[PDB]
């Protein structure tokens, strides 16, 4: 009865065959159309994975902010393979168990946190990819969020910024997850504000690990930053 | 596989075809002094190709940069550079290697002059300063308000860049173009070139269409030839 299925979240739709051909023979693929409505796509994603019995093959052709949202409501009852499009075709992320991602670490090999102590709003920046975002996020926060002296957590990577292989993505996601729990020891935050310069698979896996435990807001860059998912919306998806 | 040849002429395509693997078709894109039209036709040609692309370009580095910007960074490519009377392949089988952000730079160095939120970028591998001429143009024709300036130039290397170092120089340049954003959040980048075509292409690939950018070309004087709005509308 239980049988593997593909779920493809895409800003387009026409290109789904590339994903399908990468999967085992006779794997059905359910397409979720992302049209610039984050909460609707997350809702449809939840609806789809809720009723799936079996291993889920995921791919997401779309923003990392959406990937993070989908991760947050994914939960920990289902297994998945994450497929990523690179230098030719789709390749599976080394199959990462959900419980494995939430493992807390004492030693980090890749992530480098820079914590700036402030108030109860924490601005989280995953500064992992080619495009440098720190000053852009701070300018946006200062001009648009109307917060008093927010705390900042900028996370950069040692060595691999802008060139993260598939094979390191589970490790980077695990390390990020562990840091996001560590930071809560500094103080009790009211709210986490998430900004990404980050591969989609990592964003998804970090969302899976972090979950919907804290008040959070997810932000997307499209010429400027805007909030695209809130804790309230994500809670109401279930 | 196919080859795409972007050229200010057209008649000379056969040496490119001959350099490629047997039975590679080549599409010529004829540049006639309209940058946005050539970039449009380039994008139209490569848009639905996923596999490896062979590229060559006979024309200005400013065009090469524009083609790089709309190429994206999902597709692998070989750039065939014409040097010392023949074509030489620059194979890029991992595009992310061009986008790796660096702490250690071996071949290029930044010279940053702090100003406002317009950044004037000079990609100058010539071993003779272009800053005075660019500044005169900026002050007199663009009338920008207290722009920041970033010159990127060679260090250590005293002459031409060998083929073998062109990916490295492009990678380092691209990394510096992101590193400068640590100084402040810029609103707009203005690109001026004195540089080899393959480097311009590779830097365009990495930089992408992520910041408001304007591309300038030197032909006796400087003029803008590509804007962010035009490039956005190509897609």
Author numbering:
A (entry chain B): -2 to 235
B (entry chain A): 1 to 235
Provide passages from the article that reported this PDB entry.
Here, we show that thermophilic viruses have appropriated the SAVED domain of CalpL as an anti-CRISPR, AcrIII-2 (second anti-CRISPR of type III systems), which they use to degrade cA4.
The structure of an AcrIII-2 monomer comprises two CARF-like domains tethered by a 19-residue loop. The loop fusing the domains is followed by a six-residue β-strand that lies anti-parallel to the first β-strand of the canonical C-terminal CARF domain, in essence making this a six-stranded β-sheet. The crystal structure of AcrIII-2 revealed a dimeric composition in the absence of cA4, with SAVED subunits orientated similarly to that observed in the cryoEM structure of the CalpL filament bound to cA4. Coupled with the observation of a dimeric species formed by cross-linking in the absence of cA4, these data suggest that apo AcrIII-2 dimerises, and it is likely the dimers and longer filaments are stabilised upon cA4 binding.
